[PDB]
Design a protein around this ligand. Structure first.
Ligand SMILES: [Ca+2]
Length: 320
């Protein structure tokens, strides 16, 4: 143990869609990461928000995170926090930085769909093929109950249809108009913005990274095939011992056939860009970014625990 990850301001890790701090009170979303950071001197809290909600709205994840931030500040005596969000958690973190800029020192997003997900567009589109609409009602009930059962606090505020809509590309574009950020490039640019923002006189350091394990590698008769560069081809034991590996290869194949380009299975490189883009070259699928499932990753994947730990040191050296 040492103080490699000791930051001036407490770190809050912010989960995305489906999440909670601990699924069924047992499986950490951020697998082994709070422990690692704490062993290296960090003060780190893990938010527990609705797994299925919008980020805006009175009952949304953003207001939930804002309330949680205030409790962390009261507990630590600190005056600001460093927000580190995965997937939708990066959108939630942007919300808090925008509405309570005095309480935030930095925003880091990991695999965050700032421009939405072509996979959400796909799923929304699928539901439109039920002319009765009953598929939407039934599957929403199913997913909402999954959220209640797996939430560590059995949080009943779950709205799967709102969560799905939130993550579509059209809706994300609206979100970015409603919650603009100096850290974002222009819509349609596949570019980032500035590395910092100053909002109401409060400076925030802005960072991101992306996983791009899923690479488009062949085009034949209009159909695009992908390669999972995180793995030794086919035989990698991560394909056997982590069911998300092949699942995210499959969803990532749907993504590339909707024009996403390289992606992590559910978020494209372009969608993930925000602030100072530290890397988009990690050979990671979306769950590898949070050391999931249960620490299993392909042989070519970088160590995500070490990446996050090094980023805590980066924050420390930057003065937050
Ligand atoms: Ca994995």
């Amino acid at each position: 143990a040492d103080n490699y990850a000791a930051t001036r301001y407490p770190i809050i890790l912010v989960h995305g869609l489906t999440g909670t701090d601990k699924y069924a009170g047992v499986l950490e979303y951020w697998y082994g990461i709070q422990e690692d950071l704490q062993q290296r001197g960090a003060t780190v809290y893990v938010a527990n928000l609705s797994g299925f909600q919008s980020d805006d709205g009175p009952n949304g994840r953003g207001e939930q995170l804002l309330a949680y931030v205030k409790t962390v500040l009261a507990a630590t005596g600190a005056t600001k926090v460093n927000l580190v969000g995965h997937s939708q958690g990066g959108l939630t973190s942007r919300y808090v930085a925008a509405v309570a800029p005095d309480l935030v020192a930095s925003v880091t997003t990991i695999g965050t769909p700032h421009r939405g997900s072509e996979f959400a567009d796909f799923v929304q589109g699928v539901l439109a093929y039920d002319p009765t609409g009953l598929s939407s009602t039934v599957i929403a009930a199913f997913v909402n109950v999954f959220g209640i059962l797996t939430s560590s606090s059995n949080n009943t505020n779950q709205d799967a249809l709102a969560a799905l809509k939130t993550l579509t590309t059209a809706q994300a574009a609206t979100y970015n108009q409603n919650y603009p950020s100096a850290g974002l490039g222009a819509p349609g640019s596949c570019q980032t913005g500035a590395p910092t923002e100053t909002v109401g006189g409060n400076t925030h350091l802005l960072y991101s990274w992306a996983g791009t394990a899923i690479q488009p590698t062949i085009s034949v008769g209009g159909v695009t095939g992908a390669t999972d560069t995180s793995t030794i081809p086919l035989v990698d034991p991560a394909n056997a011992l982590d069911p998300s590996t092949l699942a995210l290869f499959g969803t990532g194949t749907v993504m590339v056939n909707r024009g996403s380009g390289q992606n992590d299975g559910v978020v494209s490189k372009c969608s993930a860009l925000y602030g100072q883009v530290l890397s988009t070259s990690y050979k990671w699928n979306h769950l590898d970014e949070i050391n999931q499932l249960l620490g299993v990753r392909g042989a070519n994947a970088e160590d995500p625990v070490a990446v996050i730990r090094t980023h805590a040191n980066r924050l420390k050296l930057a003065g937050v």
